[PDB]
Amino acid sequence: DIIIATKNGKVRGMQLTVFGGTVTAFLGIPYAQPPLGRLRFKKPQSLTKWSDIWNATKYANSCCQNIDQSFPGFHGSEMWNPNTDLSEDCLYLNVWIPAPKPKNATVLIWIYGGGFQTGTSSLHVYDGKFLARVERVIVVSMNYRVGALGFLALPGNPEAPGNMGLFDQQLALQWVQKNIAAFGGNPKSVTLFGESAGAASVSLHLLSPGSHSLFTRAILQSGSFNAPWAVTSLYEARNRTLNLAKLTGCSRENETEIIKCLRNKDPQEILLNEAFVVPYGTPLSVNFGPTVDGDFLTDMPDILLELGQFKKTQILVGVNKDEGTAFLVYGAPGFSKDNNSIITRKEFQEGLKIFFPGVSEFGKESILFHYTDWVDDQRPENYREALGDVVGDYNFICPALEFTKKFSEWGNNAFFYYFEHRSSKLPWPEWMGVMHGYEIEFVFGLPLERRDQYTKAEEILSRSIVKRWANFAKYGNPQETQNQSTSWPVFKSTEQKYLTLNTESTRIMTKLRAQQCRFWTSFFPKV
Amino acid sequence: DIIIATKNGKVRGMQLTVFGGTVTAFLGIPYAQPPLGRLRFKKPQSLTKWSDIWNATKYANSCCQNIDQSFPGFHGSEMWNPNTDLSEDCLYLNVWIPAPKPKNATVLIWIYGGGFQTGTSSLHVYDGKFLARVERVIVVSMNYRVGALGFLALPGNPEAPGNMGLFDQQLALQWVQKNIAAFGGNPKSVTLFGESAGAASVSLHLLSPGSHSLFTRAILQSGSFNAPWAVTSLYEARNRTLNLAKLTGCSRENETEIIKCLRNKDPQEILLNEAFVVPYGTPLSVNFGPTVDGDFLTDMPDILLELGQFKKTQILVGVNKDEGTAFLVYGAPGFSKDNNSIITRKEFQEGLKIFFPGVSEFGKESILFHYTDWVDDQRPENYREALGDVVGDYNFICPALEFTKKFSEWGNNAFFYYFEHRSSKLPWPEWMGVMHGYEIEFVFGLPLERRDQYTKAEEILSRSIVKRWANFAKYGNPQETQNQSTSWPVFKSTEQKYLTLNTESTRIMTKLRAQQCRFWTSFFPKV
Amino acid sequence: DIIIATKNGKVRGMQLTVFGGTVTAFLGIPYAQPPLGRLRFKKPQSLTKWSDIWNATKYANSCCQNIDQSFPGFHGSEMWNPNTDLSEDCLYLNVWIPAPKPKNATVLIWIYGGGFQTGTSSLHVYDGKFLARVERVIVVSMNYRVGALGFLALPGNPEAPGNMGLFDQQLALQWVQKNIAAFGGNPKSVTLFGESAGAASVSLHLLSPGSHSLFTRAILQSGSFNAPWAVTSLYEARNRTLNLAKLTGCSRENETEIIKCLRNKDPQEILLNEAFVVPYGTPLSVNFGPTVDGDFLTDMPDILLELGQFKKTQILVGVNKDEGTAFLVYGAPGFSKDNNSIITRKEFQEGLKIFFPGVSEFGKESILFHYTDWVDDQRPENYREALGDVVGDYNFICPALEFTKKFSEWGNNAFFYYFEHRSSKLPWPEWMGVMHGYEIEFVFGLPLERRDQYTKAEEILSRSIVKRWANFAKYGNPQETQNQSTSWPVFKSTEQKYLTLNTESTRIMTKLRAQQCRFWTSFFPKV
Numbered sequence A, B, C: 001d002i003i004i005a006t007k008n009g010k011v012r013g014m015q016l017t018v019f020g021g022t023v024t025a026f027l028g029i030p031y032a033q034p035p036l037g038r039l040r041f042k043k044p045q046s047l048t049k050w051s052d053i054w055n056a057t058k059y060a061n062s063c064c065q066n067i068d069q070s071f072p073g074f075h076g077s078e079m080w081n082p083n084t085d086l087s088e089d090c091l092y093l094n095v096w097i098p099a100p101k102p103k104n105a106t107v108l109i110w111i112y113g114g115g116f117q118t119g120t121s122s123l124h125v126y127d128g129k130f131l132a133r134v135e136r137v138i139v140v141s142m143n144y145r146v147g148a149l150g151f152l153a154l155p156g157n158p159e160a161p162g163n164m165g166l167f168d169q170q171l172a173l174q175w176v177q178k179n180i181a182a183f184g185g186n187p188k189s190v191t192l193f194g195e196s197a198g199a200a201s202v203s204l205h206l207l208s209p210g211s212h213s214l215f216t217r218a219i220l221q222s223g224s225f226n227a228p229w230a231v232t233s234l235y236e237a238r239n240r241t242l243n244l245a246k247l248t249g250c251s252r253e254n255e256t257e258i259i260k261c262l263r264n265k266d267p268q269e270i271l272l273n274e275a276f277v278v279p280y281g282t283p284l285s286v287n288f289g290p291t292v293d294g295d296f297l298t299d300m301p302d303i304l305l306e307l308g309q310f311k312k313t314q315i316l317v318g319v320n321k322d323e324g325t326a327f328l329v330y331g332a333p334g335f336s337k338d339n340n341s342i343i344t345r346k347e348f349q350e351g352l353k354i355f356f357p358g359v360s361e362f363g364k365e366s367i368l369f370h371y372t373d374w375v376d377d378q379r380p381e382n383y384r385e386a387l388g389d390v391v392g393d394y395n396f397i398c399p400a401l402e403f404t405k406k407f408s409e410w411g412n413n414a415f416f417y418y419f420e421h422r423s424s425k426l427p428w429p430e431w432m433g434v435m436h437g438y439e440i441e442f443v444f445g446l447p448l449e450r451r452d453q454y455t456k457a458e459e460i461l462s463r464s465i466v467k468r469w470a471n472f473a474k475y476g477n478p479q480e481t482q483n484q485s486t487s488w489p490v491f492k493s494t495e496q497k498y499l500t501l502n503t504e505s506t507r508i509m510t511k512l513r514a515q516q517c518r519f520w521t522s523f524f525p526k527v
């Protein structure tokens, strides 16, 4: 029976057998006041204190959110849907510790993605027990509010200031500063990691001055805040908040009154109207996301990055070979998970209109021109592959490389990876390749479980990535030093070396997507 | 009558005449609770306090240990056997101070070797009175537990966590931080030095975070923790602890119960079974040594070294010209201290089987191939000399040079020496050359005593080494500045300069054993 | 009426008219217990405290010392003799402050020379009122004990530990740390300056750890501790202390008893026997000087210099063109202040025997050989000039340049000058040229007084040196920035630039005395 005294009271954990050893898991520890009633849309308030033993022995409620119903019964989509009850009462976190209790263990804090609209820390692919067993690190993950409930903004107004879910993440970081030594963690050795919006979130903590002292370093998987979906303009945030009001019958003249009305709405009515606050979305829409609130974020983040205003520390950044494919089967015409999706030029053109709705005709033609010069055989898959690369390059890969360059120019070591292994268990079809989100299970060490039907080469790839991540967190250097592995060189401006992660042979390469990213980075923003 | 007030109470010392001056010696000051009864196999507990004057006027008990009985009556082996009573009650230390009492003297702390199975601070060759007289430094040495009593490991279990004898060393370092100013020492200028396992120990204090603030710099004579005998794997430690239990009739199912049984055993029964916890040892076996315990040592030390996780400070590292010869007369066939040991190819082959018992046939042939390409006359001593070089290069010289390279790559000054003077008094035969352990008497300044029958050239070599060591401890630079001596260059990656120590002429050389160490360092670990 | 509250009590100063303004002078403030009776030969004890106003309106007693009687009535020698009463009761200091009282003025602390046997702070040429008037700095000077009373050593014994007069200097430095803000000084901007033994003293404060925090930077005029007269060996100090005892009838067996006997002697008997503690002196003899005491000086100072163990700060160092001439008329045969001293080869040879009494015949011939290769006309003054250069190069110029090189090699800015102006008022004859001690009046700004009959070019040279010294003290850079002056380059190893100080034109030159100093520095020490 394992009980830990925290600043707010006692917590009971549970023991787990993992690989012939034990991990102690504390699932569902609260770290804030439930944000209900008058607290809805406000910054998380600090926890009152309890007396008695809080039983942290099951995952807590996931935050309210819309759910992906495009492929019911299909594991490829459903694995990402929440696996605990939805409730506004969702501000909880999990702690996995090695057994016996470590003395001063490095801490890995996971921030999930989901577009800032969805996600929960209790998914199977985020289970931190394998990392605690194998690397003897402590792993922490928190639920944070998503959608309008997490990111509604009327900026400057403390009834709905914006970025509440980023403040939920920050308050969990603070909980780890105050409490983790009780669990055997070193509050001075904390690495944030996250994927997609969780990676964009990690990048914004590098920018936020109230996060500077809450962590040591950062890992960004397929996301960074300069991605075109990651930050909402003040203009679009106000418009969306008042669009939400209009839809829920909460248009008022005093803005504090709009929010008060919005506080009387059933959470379902808020969720049901979120999709419509925008005149046309895309599969990549982030209707309620981070804004420049003057609090968490003091200025436009592109300006902070460019002018070197961020935490000086090491970063590890990477992307997957086919980031954009997952999004094509949520509305691009001629695409389907259930066939090979050989599409025509006309379909490609229609697909750009689906992904680039506010963009001028010239803008869309410039994309077509950059991506359709083949290269050369015709090649029925030409247009199918180009559309996935358009979406992946624009939304994930070029912003990650641009973030990595600008960050490294200010003197800190940066390491960049390109993940190019397709999981042998992937339920999505082959044409979708190495999809967005499908390195995560390798990072959390799921293929280390021999009972799970991953191949032996995958068990080895995962073990090595697990070691590199842990070495990054502990030592700021993502090497695998014992097995004659390829040395991972720092990513510098000028050379731009990156490491490929694959089952066959790790390679050092240079200037990932050089020609494509010149297009998105220097020309497209003008269009 | 010289009495010093310490944090734990008064201690009376004794005066010594040395070279027409006086040294005050405090021999046998306790620095921990005797580790008996319930304390056996546990970390040293801090000292209770006394009232009265503790008489520190004789060497204390040496720790329990097996003794070298291979050459009874022979000074060459017997000089290393303990010269005070053996007892579990052995956690004491010695302090030598200049007279008159210095004002803020640099402190040299000696850690003896003995394979982590043997050794004591009271040997004649470790007498710190000459260094206190001649260099006006304070010299400190401690007894620390050895064998299973010092290093039994069931890792994670505080009844027998491992590394207890390294914790004994650390607690003595703390005693010097708290007490040495009372004796006229500067706790801010402390250099650890040690030979063989004492040098491996010094290198592990560079890695241990609880030692970082207990000393300023380090000297490593013939040892470092990356030597193949210096650190036991978790796997081999558990196996050896349960092998010990089996042999003593202490196999139990609850592991805390194994230890409790082991605590009821006579110390003799533990000692008698130590040799057998392994299926085949060698003359170089370290059955109970340092382990990765998650406490003293947070990770595999090769990983810490490679990734720069150690105290940033200057080091002085060296080895003797014939490190491996001493071990050949403890079991290699055809060797003898009492003849010239001209051995055959067949004997050489048998000798590899004695020194490399777990190694594949191909592994052993690769050693034979690397070492038997002569060079060229035949040369009856060819195989005898090659076997000594195999053992010395693998076990001492290549790991020391590898440690020195990896340490210096992180920016700190490193100085490397190659000791090539054979003591005119050496009781071992000539063929054994400049043996392991036989620089020690030069370092402690025994040849400064003209009454002792060392030659005049040896008195001069010792005086100069004594000055270089003292300058290293005081100033981080092992120069002899007054007598037109050869300047000792820092050892850098790339050039790898070292200094030769000999009676004739000091030389600056480069890339000691380059061809041999490429073999042991890059190829042999794969075999 | 100007009264300042110090930590030890009130002091009344006096006003002075200087150049149509006012300076306030506090002359004779005590800074230690009078070192009489039981305190004779001991470290200065701290001052008790007074209540009442201590009148600091006249120079205090100079310390006991022998006096220069070689040229009675002659201003050239007599200007250096003490101009206040001699007494053991002599531990006082002077403060000159600008009027009105500055707010946070840089402090210049003068340490006089006199071979450590003689000197006093009240000489006319050390009057700090001109510097306080013109540069608005505060100037401080102290009397410190000289001769056996200041430097008798039985080392390790606190009844006569050695270096007492250096401890007197240090305790005055402490007085300035504690008190000078009351006078309007900045304790954080203090530059020591001194000439001859006062410069050697300044250099030893750079080495002494108890002086490190008592000052910011240093100026060395014609002296540094590596000069062959500046530091006494332990061997020669013991011999001289027991020689003193023998001469005064104080030979005893208990050494604490020797000192007690020496404490009953009239100060005159100690002074009368000082000259004889050595079997043969020279005009340059320092019978009782600094020793390595293990307290003020922790090791041989050549070792500290070479190995970089000193305060890291800027230095200003210089020498005069004819340092050695002053000494020739105190005993070299054929020399006289009252004729042109054209000497023969035989006389030169005799003169070397006078200046190098313990030196082998070969040593003396090597000097003759290095200095008598002309160059070429014969030139009756050949031997006269060579003997002055032998004495000046060996004793002053080469050690200063060697000190400056070794100091600058550790990273600090160093500025070196060569003073080559002969005072128009010099009472010594022309052949003696730019003598030792005759920059001092230029440094203290005596030629700024138009009433004094210095030339106009001298008034300008002094004004410029006064400004460079003050800029050095305030800003660490001895430039004269307003009058199109020659820029003073840092002295680096390799180039060795120095600045010439003269009435005509300042020049940047390189490698002062290169050929001569190679002789004294690398060869002569072997002889």
Ligand SMILES: *[C@@H]1O[C@H](CO[C@H]2O[C@@H](C)[C@@H](O)[C@@H](O)[C@@H]2O)[C@@H](O[C@@H]2O[C@H](CO)[C@@H](O)[C@H](O)[C@H]2NC(C)=O)[C@H](O)[C@H]1NC(C)=O
Pocket (backbone or CB within 6 Å): A332, A333, A334, A335, A336, A338, A339, A340, A341, A342
């Ligand atoms: C791959 O399938 C798509 C997607 O839509 C289809 O899913 C199929 C597996 C099948 O069940 C089909 O009946 C279903 O509608 C096909 O595109 C669709 O085809 C029709 C015309 O035949 C269009 O009018 C539809 O609008 C279009 N749907 C979308 C969303 O674009 C696609 O042609 C097929 N590709 C193949 C077989 O290569």
Ligand SMILES: *[C@@H]1O[C@H](CO[C@H]2O[C@@H](C)[C@@H](O)[C@@H](O)[C@@H]2O)[C@@H](O[C@@H]2O[C@H](CO)[C@@H](O)[C@H](O)[C@H]2NC(C)=O)[C@H](O)[C@H]1NC(C)=O
Pocket (backbone or CB within 6 Å): B332, B333, B334, B335, B336, B338, B339, B340, B341, B342
């Ligand atoms: C050097 O001596 C060895 C060691 O063993 C021997 O010690 C000798 C000094 C002598 O007392 C001898 O009787 C004693 O056994 C010799 O090797 C040994 O020789 C025999 C055969 O003659 C072998 O069967 C032994 O096993 C072997 N012992 C070991 C430990 O190997 C060795 O030959 C000798 N070398 C010489 C003289 O050059």
Ligand SMILES: *[C@@H]1O[C@H](CO[C@H]2O[C@@H](C)[C@@H](O)[C@@H](O)[C@@H]2O)[C@@H](O[C@@H]2O[C@H](CO)[C@@H](O)[C@H](O)[C@H]2NC(C)=O)[C@H](O)[C@H]1NC(C)=O
Pocket (backbone or CB within 6 Å): C332, C333, C334, C335, C336, C338, C339, C340, C341, C342
């Ligand atoms: C310069 O004078 C010296 C120094 O000694 C002398 O001082 C003179 C000015 C004069 O009063 C003289 O009588 C007095 O002794 C002369 O050297 C001295 O000369 C004599 C021989 O004539 C030697 O035997 C002395 O020992 C010697 N004295 C010393 C101290 O060396 C010197 O010759 C003279 N030089 C000239 C005039 O060029």
Ligand SMILES: *[C@H]1O[C@H](CO[C@H]2O[C@@H](C)[C@@H](O)[C@@H](O)[C@@H]2O)[C@@H](O[C@@H]2O[C@H](CO)[C@@H](O)[C@H](O)[C@H]2NC(C)=O)[C@H](O)[C@H]1NC(C)=O
Pocket (backbone or CB within 6 Å): A236, A239, A240, A242, A243, A244, A246, A247, A276, A277, A278, A279
């Ligand atoms: C933000 O403001 C208006 C609001 O229009 C919206 O009304 C909402 C409550 C919601 O239901 C939403 O779907 C609807 O679009 C946006 O105006 C739209 O623009 C179109 C033309 O593009 C006009 O027809 C309408 O005013 C409105 N659309 C529809 C379909 O009725 C406006 O575009 C937006 N501002 C932005 C995006 O910057």
Ligand SMILES: *[C@H]1O[C@H](CO[C@H]2O[C@@H](C)[C@@H](O)[C@@H](O)[C@@H]2O)[C@@H](O[C@@H]2O[C@H](CO)[C@@H](O)[C@H](O)[C@H]2NC(C)=O)[C@H](O)[C@H]1NC(C)=O
Pocket (backbone or CB within 6 Å): B236, B239, B240, B242, B243, B244, B246, B247, B276, B277, B278, B279
């Ligand atoms: C660790 O575990 C076993 C234990 O075997 C040992 O039993 C001990 C109590 C002790 O007396 C020791 O000498 C004995 O070896 C090791 O198994 C050995 O391996 C051999 C074959 O190599 C087998 O015959 C036995 O199981 C045993 N040896 C003997 C001679 O009986 C095992 O090798 C070891 N694990 C390691 C080294 O990783």
Ligand SMILES: *[C@H]1O[C@H](CO[C@H]2O[C@@H](C)[C@@H](O)[C@@H](O)[C@@H]2O)[C@@H](O[C@@H]2O[C@H](CO)[C@@H](O)[C@H](O)[C@H]2NC(C)=O)[C@H](O)[C@H]1NC(C)=O
Pocket (backbone or CB within 6 Å): C236, C239, C240, C242, C243, C244, C246, C247, C276, C277, C278, C279
């Ligand atoms: C230090 O010790 C002796 C002491 O000799 C001295 O006696 C003193 C009290 C004093 O009066 C002094 O003038 C006298 O020299 C030194 O011995 C001298 O050396 C000479 C030969 O050089 C011998 O004749 C005597 O022992 C003595 N001199 C005289 C003239 O009587 C000794 O040289 C010295 N040690 C050193 C310098 O290292």
Ligand SMILES: *[C@@H]1O[C@H](CO)[C@@H](O)[C@H](O)[C@H]1NC(C)=O
Pocket (backbone or CB within 6 Å): A012, A055
């Ligand atoms: C916590 O769990 C234990 C079950 O072992 C139980 O004794 C205790 O009552 C629980 N607390 C609850 C249910 O609030």
Ligand SMILES: *[C@@H]1O[C@H](CO)[C@@H](O)[C@H](O)[C@H]1NC(C)=O
Pocket (backbone or CB within 6 Å): A103, A104, A186, A188, A189, B209
């Ligand atoms: C943990 O390590 C840090 C340095 O990262 C240290 O300051 C701290 O005190 C350690 N705490 C322990 C061992 O409890």
Ligand SMILES: *[C@@H]1O[C@H](CO)[C@@H](O)[C@H](O)[C@H]1NC(C)=O
Pocket (backbone or CB within 6 Å): A254, A256, A257
């Ligand atoms: C609007 O109403 C709120 C809450 O009822 C009140 O506190 C606020 O001052 C009002 N402001 C304006 C501008 O009407």
Ligand SMILES: *[C@@H]1O[C@H](CO)[C@@H](O)[C@H](O)[C@H]1NC(C)=O
Pocket (backbone or CB within 6 Å): A463, A464, A467, A480, A482, A483
């Ligand atoms: C290194 O290699 C071993 C054995 O060859 C393997 O089992 C282990 O997984 C590897 N470790 C890492 C961190 O990749």
Ligand SMILES: *[C@@H]1O[C@H](CO)[C@@H](O)[C@H](O)[C@H]1NC(C)=O
Pocket (backbone or CB within 6 Å): B012, B055
């Ligand atoms: C310590 O030694 C002295 C001997 O000079 C003695 O007076 C005292 O009793 C001793 N203490 C012991 C034996 O415990």
Ligand SMILES: *[C@@H]1O[C@H](CO)[C@@H](O)[C@H](O)[C@H]1NC(C)=O
Pocket (backbone or CB within 6 Å): B103, B104, B186, B188, B189, C209
């Ligand atoms: C000893 O030296 C240190 C610096 O190494 C200094 O900080 C300390 O106070 C000194 N103590 C003394 C002289 O007692």
Ligand SMILES: *[C@@H]1O[C@H](CO)[C@@H](O)[C@H](O)[C@H]1NC(C)=O
Pocket (backbone or CB within 6 Å): B254, B256, B257
């Ligand atoms: C084993 O016994 C010990 C001591 O008697 C006890 O404290 C411990 O909890 C037990 N553990 C197990 C796993 O049996």
Ligand SMILES: *[C@@H]1O[C@H](CO)[C@@H](O)[C@H](O)[C@H]1NC(C)=O
Pocket (backbone or CB within 6 Å): B463, B464, B467, B480, B482, B483
């Ligand atoms: C230096 O040389 C001297 C005298 O020539 C000698 O006696 C002494 O031992 C030497 N010192 C050192 C430190 O080697």
Ligand SMILES: *[C@@H]1O[C@H](CO)[C@@H](O)[C@H](O)[C@H]1NC(C)=O
Pocket (backbone or CB within 6 Å): C012, C055
């Ligand atoms: C100090 O000087 C003044 C003279 O103006 C006087 O009043 C006072 O008595 C003096 N103190 C003495 C002489 O101790």
Ligand SMILES: *[C@@H]1O[C@H](CO)[C@@H](O)[C@H](O)[C@H]1NC(C)=O
Pocket (backbone or CB within 6 Å): C103, C104, C186, C188, C189
């Ligand atoms: C004098 O200047 C120093 C910096 O050199 C500053 O720290 C100090 O407080 C100042 N004091 C004054 C103006 O009284």
